[PDB]
Short mmCIF file of C-alpha atoms (C1' of nucleotides) in Angstrom, two decimals:
data_model
loop_
_atom_site.label_atom_id
_atom_site.label_comp_id
_atom_site.label_asym_id
_atom_site.label_seq_id
_atom_site.Cartn_x
_atom_site.Cartn_y
_atom_site.Cartn_z
CA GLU W 1 0.62 59.01 -22.73
CA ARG W 2 3.46 59.08 -20.22
CA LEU W 3 1.05 57.49 -17.46
CA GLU W 4 0.89 53.91 -17.91
CA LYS W 5 -3.00 52.68 -18.64
CA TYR W 6 -4.17 49.06 -17.89
CA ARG W 7 -6.04 48.12 -20.96
CA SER W 8 -8.34 46.20 -18.71
CA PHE W 9 -10.28 47.01 -15.50
CA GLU W 10 -9.51 43.79 -14.06
CA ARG W 11 -5.59 44.31 -14.33
CA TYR W 12 -6.03 47.09 -12.43
CA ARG W 13 -8.42 45.53 -10.03
CA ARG W 14 -6.09 42.35 -9.62
CA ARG W 15 -2.80 44.77 -9.34
CA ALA W 16 -4.80 46.92 -6.48
CA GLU W 17 -5.66 43.70 -4.78
CA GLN W 18 -1.95 42.89 -4.84
CA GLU W 19 -1.00 46.23 -3.79
CA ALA W 20 -3.93 46.21 -0.79
CA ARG W 21 -2.02 42.73 0.27
CA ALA W 22 1.05 44.50 1.09
CA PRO W 23 1.16 46.42 4.05
CA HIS W 24 1.22 50.12 3.40
CA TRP W 25 1.75 53.50 5.01
CA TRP W 26 -1.95 54.62 3.78
CA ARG W 27 -4.71 52.57 5.58
CA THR W 28 -6.10 49.38 4.19
CA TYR W 29 -8.66 47.01 4.90
CA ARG W 30 -6.12 44.00 5.64
CA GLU W 31 -4.19 45.91 8.17
CA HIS W 32 -7.48 46.78 10.60
CA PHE W 33 -8.72 43.06 9.64
CA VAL W 34 -5.62 40.97 9.44
CA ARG W 35 14.51 15.68 -13.48
CA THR W 36 15.83 17.79 -16.35
CA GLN W 37 16.26 14.94 -18.63
CA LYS W 38 12.47 14.07 -18.01
CA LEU W 39 11.56 17.39 -18.80
CA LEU W 40 13.41 17.46 -22.28
CA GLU W 41 11.90 13.98 -23.23
CA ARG W 42 8.50 15.45 -22.39
CA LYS W 43 9.22 18.56 -24.37
CA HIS W 44 9.84 16.12 -27.37
CA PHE W 45 6.50 14.97 -27.05
CA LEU W 46 4.73 18.36 -26.91
CA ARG W 47 6.41 19.21 -30.09
CA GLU W 48 4.72 15.99 -31.60
CA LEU W 49 1.36 16.99 -30.43
CA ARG W 50 1.86 20.39 -31.66
CA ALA W 51 3.01 18.72 -34.94
CA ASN W 52 -0.05 16.60 -35.62
CA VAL W 53 -2.49 17.79 -37.89
CA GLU W 54 -5.38 16.12 -36.59
CA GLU W 55 -5.02 17.93 -33.29
CA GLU W 56 -4.88 21.34 -35.03
CA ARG W 57 -7.69 20.54 -37.18
CA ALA W 58 -10.11 20.12 -33.85
CA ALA W 59 -8.66 23.20 -32.59
CA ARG W 60 -9.75 25.11 -35.51
CA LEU W 61 -12.88 23.25 -35.49
CA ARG W 62 -13.53 23.60 -31.80
CA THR W 63 -14.56 20.19 -31.51
CA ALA W 64 -11.41 19.06 -29.35
CA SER W 65 -11.85 17.19 -26.13
CA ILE W 66 -9.72 16.16 -23.15
CA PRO W 67 -10.01 12.89 -21.09
CA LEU W 68 -10.50 14.17 -17.23
CA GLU W 69 -9.54 10.63 -15.71
CA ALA W 70 -6.20 10.35 -17.46
CA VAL W 71 -4.97 14.27 -16.52
CA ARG W 72 -6.25 13.51 -12.84
CA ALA W 73 -3.58 10.52 -12.23
CA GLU W 74 -1.05 12.05 -13.91
CA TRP W 75 -1.73 15.39 -11.90
CA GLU W 76 -1.39 13.42 -8.42
CA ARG W 77 2.23 11.93 -9.28
CA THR W 78 3.38 15.60 -10.36
CA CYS W 79 2.05 17.70 -7.93
CA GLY W 80 -0.60 16.25 -6.29
CA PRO W 81 0.87 16.10 -2.62
CA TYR W 82 1.49 19.82 -2.59
CA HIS W 83 -2.15 20.45 -3.08
CA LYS W 84 -2.75 17.87 -0.57
CA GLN W 85 -1.18 20.11 1.99
CA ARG W 86 -3.05 23.21 1.03
CA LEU W 87 -6.22 21.69 1.87
CA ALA W 88 -5.37 20.07 5.12
CA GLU W 89 -3.88 23.64 6.32
CA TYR W 90 -6.94 25.28 4.74
CA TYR W 91 -9.12 23.41 6.99
CA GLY W 92 -7.15 23.91 10.04
CA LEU W 93 -6.34 20.16 10.40
CA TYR W 94 -2.81 21.05 11.17
CA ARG W 95 -3.19 23.84 13.97
CA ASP W 96 -5.79 21.49 15.83
CA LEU W 97 -3.89 18.14 15.39
CA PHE W 98 -0.20 19.11 15.69
CA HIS W 99 -0.59 22.29 17.23
CA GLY W 100 0.55 24.47 14.27
CA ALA W 101 3.31 21.68 12.79
CA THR W 102 3.05 21.71 9.18
CA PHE W 103 4.06 18.47 7.05
CA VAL W 104 3.99 18.12 3.22
CA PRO W 105 2.08 15.14 2.44
CA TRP W 106 3.93 12.17 0.64
CA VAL W 107 1.95 9.10 0.67
CA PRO W 108 -0.97 9.92 -1.47
CA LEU W 109 -3.63 8.43 0.92
CA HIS W 110 -7.13 7.80 -0.42
CA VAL W 111 -10.12 6.68 1.34
CA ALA W 112 -13.64 5.61 0.37
CA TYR W 113 -16.79 4.40 2.67
CA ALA W 114 -17.89 1.01 1.18
CA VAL W 115 -21.56 1.30 0.42
CA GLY W 116 -22.32 -2.34 1.04
CA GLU W 117 -20.47 -4.18 -1.69
CA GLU W 118 -21.75 -2.78 -4.88
CA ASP W 119 -19.87 0.74 -4.22
CA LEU W 120 -17.72 2.72 -1.94
CA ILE W 121 -18.39 6.52 -1.27
CA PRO W 122 -15.16 8.18 -1.62
CA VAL W 123 -13.77 10.35 1.01
CA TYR W 124 -12.31 13.62 -0.74
CA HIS W 125 -10.04 16.13 0.95
CA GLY W 126 -12.90 18.53 2.72
CA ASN W 127 -15.85 16.33 1.09
CA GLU W 128 -19.17 15.80 2.45
CA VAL W 129 -20.37 12.09 3.58
CA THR W 130 -23.61 11.94 5.61
CA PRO W 131 -23.19 10.26 8.87
CA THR W 132 -25.72 7.58 7.51
CA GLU W 133 -22.96 6.96 4.89
CA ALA W 134 -20.51 6.33 7.70
CA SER W 135 -21.92 3.71 9.63
CA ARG W 136 -19.46 1.10 8.70
CA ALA W 137 -15.66 1.43 8.53
CA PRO W 138 -14.31 2.95 5.42
CA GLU W 139 -11.58 1.49 2.87
CA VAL W 140 -8.20 2.93 2.90
CA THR W 141 -5.93 2.54 -0.20
CA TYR W 142 -2.34 3.90 -0.37
CA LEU W 143 5.44 -0.50 9.22
CA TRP W 144 2.71 2.25 9.29
CA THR W 145 0.03 3.67 11.60
CA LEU W 146 -3.40 4.47 10.50
CA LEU W 147 -5.57 6.92 13.09
CA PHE W 148 -9.02 8.27 13.03
CA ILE W 149 -10.09 11.57 14.60
CA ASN W 150 -13.08 13.60 15.01
CA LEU W 151 -11.72 17.13 15.40
CA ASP W 152 -14.57 19.00 16.47
CA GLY W 153 -16.76 15.86 17.27
CA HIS W 154 -16.15 16.32 20.94
CA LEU W 155 -18.96 17.21 22.73
CA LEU W 156 -17.51 18.61 26.01
CA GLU W 157 -14.26 19.86 25.74
CA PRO W 158 -12.68 22.07 22.84
CA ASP W 159 -9.30 20.61 22.71
CA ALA W 160 -10.22 16.76 23.12
CA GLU W 161 -11.37 14.71 20.39
CA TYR W 162 -12.32 11.01 19.85
CA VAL W 163 -11.12 8.33 18.04
CA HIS W 164 -13.07 6.42 15.33
CA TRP W 165 -10.91 3.55 15.06
CA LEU W 166 -6.81 3.44 15.46
CA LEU W 167 -4.68 0.65 13.95
CA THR W 168 -0.84 0.10 14.58
CA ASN W 169 2.11 -1.72 13.21
CA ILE W 170 0.28 -1.92 9.50
CA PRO W 171 2.54 -3.79 7.39
CA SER W 172 2.76 -2.33 3.93
CA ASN W 173 -0.31 -1.40 2.45
CA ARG W 174 -2.57 -4.19 4.00
CA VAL W 175 -4.69 -2.97 6.88
CA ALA W 176 -6.33 -6.03 8.13
CA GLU W 177 -3.22 -6.97 9.89
CA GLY W 178 -3.21 -3.78 11.98
CA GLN W 179 -3.80 -4.17 15.74
CA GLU W 180 -7.46 -3.16 16.31
CA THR W 181 -6.36 -0.47 19.35
CA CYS W 182 -9.66 1.28 18.96
CA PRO W 183 -12.88 -0.49 17.75
CA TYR W 184 -14.84 1.16 15.15
CA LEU W 185 -17.42 3.73 15.84
CA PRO W 186 -19.82 5.40 13.61
CA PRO W 187 -19.70 9.36 13.71
CA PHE W 188 -21.97 10.91 16.28
CA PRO W 189 -22.05 14.64 15.15
CA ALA W 190 -24.02 17.00 17.41
CA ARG W 191 -27.18 18.80 15.78
CA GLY W 192 -26.96 22.29 15.13
CA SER W 193 -23.06 22.12 15.18
CA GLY W 194 -22.74 22.56 11.40
CA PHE W 195 -20.12 20.59 9.58
CA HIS W 196 -17.66 18.38 11.69
CA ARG W 197 -14.34 17.67 10.06
CA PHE W 198 -12.50 14.36 10.58
CA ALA W 199 -9.14 13.76 9.53
CA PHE W 200 -7.44 10.49 8.87
CA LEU W 201 -3.65 10.44 9.21
CA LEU W 202 -0.94 8.01 8.17
CA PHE W 203 2.57 8.30 10.02
CA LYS W 204 5.59 6.53 8.85
CA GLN W 205 6.50 3.76 11.32
CA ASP W 206 10.45 3.33 11.55
CA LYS W 207 10.42 0.49 13.92
CA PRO W 208 7.53 -1.70 15.21
CA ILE W 209 6.21 -0.10 18.46
CA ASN W 210 3.46 -1.80 20.36
CA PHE W 211 0.98 0.96 21.59
CA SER W 212 -0.33 -0.95 24.70
CA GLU W 213 -0.89 2.59 26.28
CA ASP W 214 -3.35 3.32 23.36
CA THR W 215 -5.03 -0.03 23.14
CA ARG W 216 -8.63 0.23 23.92
CA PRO W 217 -11.21 -2.34 25.01
CA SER W 218 -13.04 -3.78 21.85
CA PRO W 219 -15.91 -2.98 21.99
CA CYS W 220 -15.74 0.33 23.75
CA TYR W 221 -18.81 2.48 24.00
CA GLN W 222 -17.47 5.00 26.77
CA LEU W 223 -16.87 8.55 25.48
CA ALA W 224 -14.62 9.23 28.76
CA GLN W 225 -12.44 6.72 27.23
CA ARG W 226 -12.34 7.91 23.73
CA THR W 227 -11.16 11.24 24.84
CA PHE W 228 -7.45 11.91 23.75
CA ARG W 229 -5.09 14.47 22.44
CA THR W 230 -3.36 14.14 19.11
CA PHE W 231 -0.39 16.46 20.12
CA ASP W 232 0.77 14.79 23.30
CA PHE W 233 0.07 11.34 21.32
CA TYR W 234 2.34 12.19 18.40
CA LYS W 235 4.90 13.97 20.82
CA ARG W 236 5.21 10.54 22.68
CA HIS W 237 5.48 8.69 19.11
CA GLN W 238 7.20 11.81 17.48
CA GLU W 239 10.45 9.68 17.14
CA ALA W 240 9.13 6.99 15.37
CA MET W 241 6.19 8.67 13.55
CA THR W 242 6.32 11.20 10.59
CA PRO W 243 2.80 12.17 9.12
CA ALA W 244 2.97 11.34 5.27
CA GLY W 245 -1.05 10.45 4.19
CA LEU W 246 -4.06 12.76 4.90
CA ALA W 247 -7.78 12.46 3.94
CA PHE W 248 -10.60 14.26 5.37
CA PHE W 249 -14.35 14.84 5.00
CA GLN W 250 -17.05 16.70 6.57
CA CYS W 251 -20.51 15.66 8.05
CA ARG W 252 -23.96 17.03 9.19
CA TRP W 253 -26.36 15.95 11.65
CA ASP W 254 -28.39 13.13 10.34
CA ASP W 255 -31.04 10.32 11.18
CA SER W 256 -28.08 7.77 11.77
CA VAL W 257 -26.44 10.26 14.54
CA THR W 258 -29.72 9.41 16.52
CA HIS W 259 -29.06 5.87 16.28
CA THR W 260 -25.43 6.07 17.21
CA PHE W 261 -26.19 8.00 20.24
CA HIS W 262 -28.89 5.71 21.54
CA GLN W 263 -28.22 2.38 20.40
CA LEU W 264 -24.73 1.98 21.50
CA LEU W 265 -23.27 5.23 22.75
CA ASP W 266 -26.58 4.67 24.87
CA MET W 267 -26.94 8.80 25.77
CA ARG W 268 -29.10 11.57 24.99
CA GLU W 269 -28.69 13.05 21.67
CA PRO W 270 -26.66 16.44 21.99
CA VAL W 271 -28.39 19.53 20.54
CA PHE W 272 -26.87 23.10 20.31
CA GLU W 273 -27.47 26.22 18.16
CA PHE W 274 -25.54 29.52 18.18
CA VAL W 275 -27.42 32.52 20.09
CA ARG W 276 -26.81 35.79 18.13
CA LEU W 277 -47.14 62.09 39.08
CA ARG W 278 -44.87 63.54 41.69
CA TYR W 279 -42.61 60.42 41.82
CA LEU W 280 -43.39 58.78 38.59
CA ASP W 281 -42.83 62.30 36.64
CA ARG W 282 -39.14 61.90 37.39
CA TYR W 283 -39.22 58.21 36.04
CA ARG W 284 -41.31 59.43 33.08
CA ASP W 285 -40.44 61.43 30.47
CA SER W 286 -43.12 64.28 31.55
CA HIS W 287 -41.63 66.58 34.27
CA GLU O 1 -16.57 31.99 -55.57
CA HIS O 2 -14.59 29.39 -53.59
CA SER O 3 -15.72 25.87 -52.29
CA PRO O 4 -15.99 24.95 -48.88
CA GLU O 5 -13.12 22.96 -49.26
CA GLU O 6 -10.90 25.48 -50.83
CA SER O 7 -11.65 27.73 -47.94
CA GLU O 8 -10.74 24.87 -45.62
CA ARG O 9 -7.69 24.41 -47.64
CA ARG O 10 -6.77 28.07 -47.95
CA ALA O 11 -7.32 28.37 -43.92
CA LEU O 12 -4.39 26.08 -43.41
CA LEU O 13 -2.26 27.79 -45.40
CA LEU O 14 -3.06 31.49 -44.28
CA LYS O 15 -2.08 30.05 -40.94
CA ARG O 16 1.51 29.21 -42.33
CA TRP O 17 1.30 32.57 -44.49
CA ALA O 18 0.81 34.35 -41.09
CA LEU O 19 3.54 32.24 -39.36
CA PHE O 20 5.63 32.80 -42.31
CA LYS O 21 5.31 36.43 -42.06
CA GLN O 22 5.43 36.68 -38.27
CA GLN O 23 9.09 34.91 -38.15
CA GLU O 24 10.17 37.53 -41.15
CA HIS O 25 8.97 40.28 -38.78
CA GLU O 26 10.81 38.75 -36.04
CA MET O 27 14.10 38.57 -37.89
CA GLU O 28 13.24 41.77 -40.01
CA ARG O 29 12.79 43.49 -36.55
CA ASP O 30 16.12 41.86 -34.96
CA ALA O 31 17.77 42.78 -38.44
CA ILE O 32 16.77 46.32 -37.86
CA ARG O 33 18.44 46.30 -34.43
CA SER O 34 21.51 44.78 -35.73
CA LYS E 1 -27.48 6.44 32.82
CA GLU E 2 -24.33 8.12 33.10
CA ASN E 3 -23.72 8.54 29.47
CA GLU E 4 -26.57 10.28 29.02
CA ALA E 5 -24.84 13.73 30.80
CA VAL E 6 -24.42 16.26 27.72
CA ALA E 7 -22.47 19.71 27.79
CA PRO E 8 -24.52 22.80 27.69
CA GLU E 9 -22.49 24.18 24.42
CA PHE E 10 -20.61 22.64 21.70
CA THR E 11 -17.23 23.39 20.82
CA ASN E 12 -17.02 23.37 17.20
CA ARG E 13 -13.51 24.65 15.74
CA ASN E 14 -14.05 23.77 12.00
CA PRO E 15 -13.04 27.02 9.90
CA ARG E 16 -15.75 26.23 7.43
CA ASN E 17 -18.27 25.35 10.25
CA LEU E 18 -20.31 28.67 9.86
CA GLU E 19 -19.41 28.93 6.06
CA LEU E 20 -21.02 26.04 4.97
CA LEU E 21 -23.76 26.07 7.47
CA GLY E 22 -24.26 29.91 5.88
CA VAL E 23 -24.03 31.55 9.03
CA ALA E 24 -20.39 32.82 8.67
CA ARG E 25 -20.02 36.51 7.99
CA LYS E 26 -19.55 37.85 4.22
CA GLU E 27 -17.70 41.05 3.53
CA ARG E 28 -20.27 43.78 3.51
CA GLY E 29 -17.84 46.65 3.55
CA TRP E 30 -16.01 48.24 0.37
CA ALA E 31 -19.38 50.28 -0.11
CA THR E 32 -17.16 52.78 -2.13
CA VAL E 33 -15.63 50.36 -4.35
CA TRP E 34 -17.30 47.67 -7.06
CA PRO E 35 -18.03 44.95 -7.38
CA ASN E 36 -19.71 43.28 -4.12
CA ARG E 37 -17.52 41.49 -1.60
CA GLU E 38 -20.70 39.21 -0.45
CA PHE E 39 -18.91 35.83 -1.75
CA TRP E 40 -17.13 33.58 0.45
CA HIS E 41 -15.22 31.95 -2.78
CA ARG E 42 -14.51 33.63 -6.17
CA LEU E 43 -13.59 32.26 -9.68
CA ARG E 44 -10.50 34.21 -10.67
CA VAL E 45 -9.63 33.11 -14.35
CA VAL E 46 -6.23 34.53 -15.66
CA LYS E 47 -5.64 34.22 -19.41
CA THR E 48 -1.64 34.93 -20.12
CA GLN E 49 -0.16 35.05 -23.46
CA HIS E 50 0.59 31.46 -23.69
CA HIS E 51 -1.34 29.93 -20.68
CA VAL E 52 -4.89 29.95 -19.47
CA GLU E 53 -5.44 29.41 -15.91
CA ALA E 54 -8.35 29.42 -13.22
CA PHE E 55 -8.31 30.24 -9.40
CA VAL E 56 -10.94 29.71 -6.99
CA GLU E 57 -10.06 31.97 -3.73
CA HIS E 58 -11.72 32.31 -0.72
CA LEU E 59 -12.12 35.57 1.03
CA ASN E 60 -9.01 35.21 3.24
CA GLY E 61 -6.83 35.30 0.02
CA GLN E 62 -6.08 31.62 -0.20
CA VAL E 63 -6.57 29.84 -3.15
CA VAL E 64 -8.25 26.60 -2.57
CA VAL E 65 -8.70 25.18 -5.92
CA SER E 66 -5.97 26.28 -8.48
CA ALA E 67 -6.17 25.07 -12.22
CA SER E 68 -3.51 26.01 -14.51
CA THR E 69 -2.66 24.77 -18.41
CA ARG E 70 0.89 25.09 -17.55
CA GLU E 71 0.54 21.40 -15.03
CA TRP E 72 1.88 18.74 -16.81
CA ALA E 73 -1.10 16.51 -16.61
CA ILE E 74 -3.58 18.77 -18.52
CA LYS E 75 -1.19 20.06 -21.00
CA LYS E 76 -0.05 16.90 -22.39
CA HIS E 77 -3.63 16.01 -23.27
CA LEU E 78 -4.19 19.49 -24.55
CA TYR E 79 -3.27 20.70 -28.10
CA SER E 80 -2.78 24.25 -27.32
CA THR E 81 -2.67 26.20 -24.03
CA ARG E 82 -4.54 29.41 -25.47
CA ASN E 83 -7.58 28.09 -27.11
CA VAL E 84 -11.55 28.28 -26.57
CA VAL E 85 -11.28 24.22 -25.79
CA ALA E 86 -8.63 24.91 -23.37
CA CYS E 87 -10.80 27.36 -21.57
CA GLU E 88 -13.26 24.35 -21.67
CA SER E 89 -10.81 21.83 -20.66
CA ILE E 90 -9.68 24.01 -17.96
CA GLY E 91 -13.05 24.74 -16.53
CA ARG E 92 -13.81 21.07 -16.32
CA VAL E 93 -10.29 20.34 -14.57
CA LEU E 94 -11.03 23.47 -12.68
CA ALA E 95 -14.47 21.27 -12.02
CA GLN E 96 -12.64 18.40 -11.56
CA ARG E 97 -10.10 20.24 -8.77
CA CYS E 98 -13.29 21.81 -7.43
CA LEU E 99 -15.07 18.32 -7.10
CA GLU E 100 -11.30 17.14 -5.59
CA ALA E 101 -11.35 20.22 -2.92
CA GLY E 102 -14.65 19.60 -1.83
CA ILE E 103 -16.06 23.10 -2.63
CA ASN E 104 -19.58 23.33 -4.64
CA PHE E 105 -20.18 26.77 -4.76
CA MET E 106 -18.43 29.88 -5.99
CA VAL E 107 -19.17 33.34 -7.10
CA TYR E 108 -17.92 34.54 -10.80
CA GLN E 109 -18.02 38.17 -11.78
CA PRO E 110 -16.96 38.23 -15.32
CA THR E 111 -16.09 41.40 -16.72
CA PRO E 112 -18.15 43.07 -20.11
CA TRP E 113 -15.47 41.74 -22.79
CA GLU E 114 -14.64 38.81 -20.81
CA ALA E 115 -18.23 37.77 -20.10
CA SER E 116 -18.64 37.95 -24.13
CA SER E 117 -16.04 35.94 -24.68
CA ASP E 118 -17.19 32.38 -26.11
CA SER E 119 -14.36 30.58 -24.47
CA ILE E 120 -15.16 32.03 -20.84
CA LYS E 121 -18.78 31.38 -21.67
CA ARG E 122 -18.10 27.75 -22.78
CA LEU E 123 -15.92 27.49 -19.81
CA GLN E 124 -19.00 28.42 -17.47
CA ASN E 125 -20.84 25.72 -19.70
CA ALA E 126 -18.25 23.38 -18.65
CA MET E 127 -18.79 24.57 -14.77
CA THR E 128 -22.37 24.33 -14.73
CA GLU E 129 -22.58 20.96 -16.43
CA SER E 130 -20.11 19.67 -13.44
CA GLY E 131 -22.24 21.08 -10.80
CA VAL E 132 -20.07 23.79 -9.73
CA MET E 133 -22.36 26.95 -9.16
CA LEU E 134 -21.40 30.35 -10.45
CA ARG E 135 -23.55 31.78 -7.40
CA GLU E 136 -23.00 31.16 -3.57
CA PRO E 137 -25.68 30.73 -1.26
CA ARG E 138 -26.73 33.74 0.61
CA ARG E 139 -25.60 34.49 4.18
CA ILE E 140 -27.93 33.31 7.13
CA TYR E 141 -28.58 36.51 9.43
"C1'" G J 1 47.02 34.58 -30.11
"C1'" U J 2 47.13 38.97 -26.14
"C1'" U J 3 42.53 41.84 -23.90
"C1'" A J 4 37.73 41.92 -23.96
"C1'" A J 5 33.16 41.28 -24.82
"C1'" U J 6 29.21 37.17 -24.76
"C1'" G J 7 26.02 32.44 -25.90
"C1'" U J 8 16.93 30.51 -21.83
"C1'" A J 9 12.57 33.03 -27.74
"C1'" G J 10 12.55 40.75 -28.92
"C1'" C J 11 12.68 41.72 -22.63
"C1'" U J 12 13.78 39.17 -17.49
"C1'" U J 13 18.48 36.84 -12.60
"C1'" A J 14 11.31 33.32 -14.71
"C1'" A J 15 12.97 29.12 -13.13
"C1'" U J 16 15.87 25.37 -12.04
"C1'" A J 17 10.93 23.01 -7.92
"C1'" C J 18 5.30 21.64 -8.81
"C1'" A J 19 6.39 25.14 -15.13
"C1'" A J 20 11.43 25.40 -19.28
"C1'" A J 21 7.49 31.13 -17.04
"C1'" G J 22 5.48 36.11 -17.41
"C1'" C J 23 6.07 40.17 -20.57
"C1'" A J 24 6.69 42.34 -25.52
"C1'" A J 25 5.37 40.28 -30.40
"C1'" A J 26 1.58 37.87 -34.29
"C1'" G J 27 -3.08 36.06 -38.29
"C1'" C J 28 -8.33 37.10 -39.00
"C1'" A J 29 -12.83 39.04 -37.83
"C1'" C J 30 -14.98 44.00 -36.09
"C1'" U J 31 -14.33 49.39 -40.90
"C1'" G J 32 -12.67 56.79 -39.68
"C1'" A J 33 -7.06 55.96 -37.61
"C1'" A J 34 -5.86 53.99 -32.98
"C1'" A J 35 -7.13 51.42 -28.99
"C1'" A J 36 -10.30 48.05 -27.23
"C1'" U J 37 -12.95 43.19 -28.22
"C1'" G J 38 -13.74 37.94 -30.16
"C1'" C J 39 -11.11 33.80 -32.50
"C1'" U J 40 -6.48 32.29 -33.50
"C1'" U J 41 -0.46 32.03 -34.82
"C1'" A J 42 5.25 30.84 -33.72
"C1'" G J 43 8.75 30.11 -30.89
"C1'" A J 44 15.00 29.32 -26.10
"C1'" U J 45 18.71 27.12 -22.42
"C1'" G J 46 24.05 27.73 -29.72
"C1'" G J 47 26.98 26.51 -23.17
"C1'" A J 48 29.09 23.57 -18.83
"C1'" U J 49 30.27 23.56 -13.53
"C1'" A J 50 28.02 21.88 -8.03
"C1'" U J 51 34.88 30.86 -14.04
"C1'" C J 52 36.94 29.32 -18.07
"C1'" C J 53 34.51 27.22 -22.44
"C1'" C J 54 34.00 26.41 -27.83
"C1'" A J 55 31.41 29.49 -31.39
"C1'" U J 56 30.75 34.41 -32.38
"C1'" A J 57 32.44 40.10 -32.70
"C1'" A J 58 35.79 44.00 -31.50
"C1'" A J 59 40.33 47.20 -29.32
"C1'" C J 60 45.55 45.01 -29.54
"C1'" A J 61 46.07 42.24 -33.75
#
RNA sequence: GUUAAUGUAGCUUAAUACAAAGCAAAGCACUGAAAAUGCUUAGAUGGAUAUCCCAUAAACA
């Protein structure tokens, strides 16, 4: 009785997993392989909800339901930005884009790809959107600077990346007024490279700055001029640029990708795949 | 034999009776501690 | 055409490139311990005394999707944090957060008593209807 | 009144940030008892700084 006994196996498993996370003298797997007033007002509503007999009746009748849409909007306002950072960091955007610099987003950036005019394809964090679905520029809803990247879409150099379209001196929310430094190009992910992560970055602009260096010919179909580095570009403008918004999706190869490489990029489709007696008696076993 | 309506009515107050006892025990346990 | 030049090998850097493709390595160790580690993501469901929480954790130990009833948005519309419906709601909320995160596949390993729980079963029913798969794809060798 | 305690919910310096948290405790079902398990129940800043403090309760009194 003196020894403590967890009343469920998982509690020991969770405790053991938590114990394994911390380093220990004994060998473990990881070592080898590794405001207030608002709340008071909120609480008053909670007591009212508990008091409501109808809610209690549903609970005992196990028929109660909750509206997902209402919860979703509230969640974004309260702690949504913090979760936004986790997804970006988990996908390695910060390490690849800013060389390890980490920023908590503050602007709830949202992007969706317009399917003609009837509907527009969402762009979640870590979303999956086919290149066929990216033939057009997406709608962004959130001065400012708006930038598009294919983090791993570069075909020749690992560190380098290409811009889809870059807008500068964006006034407030409207994006039509931004300078079209880079014309829009549809995604061109190489076949057999799996999922390419594309990150959409929003930077706060303290003062309007003309990015004549970042201006590119419209239309431009050359990869040699599309290649760029986010880190040095951000460093050159780090004084007036503080990132606050994010949105990124993953895309596979698709039939449109063949069209993009050939019709306008005008180059071969890139294809890759990960690759996993006397004299002779002495030579042979017999001797 | 209780009717289904009676069980529903009793079920609601049985929760209150459980609540009334539960509150008493907390006070009773604290009362013993004092 | 000069553009036709293409490099011999790609330089994909996405952490989930292999994982989403299915070629990423799955933990094949821990042969002396139960259960299996052949899962990229796992659903961790923790029921506290007053709150019910469900998390999705990758092999690296970083939760990507975290659903908790203590969160303000869900609870204000949720009558009692501890309830069978709460497990259903958190499952749908966890699914919606799973929808938010872009993760479609996860491995769930309920315990004998947890599996028997109707609330967890309904929570799984909420997950399956929302599309979140309780079984992950097999690794590609 | 002098000394002194002592004031988020049984416990916690959980927290003042994105939640007033986790843990203890509770009804019923399940019949050796217990425990386990399913489904369910109730709650706090009696209080401030960004130490006094009033309340409370003691030795002095």
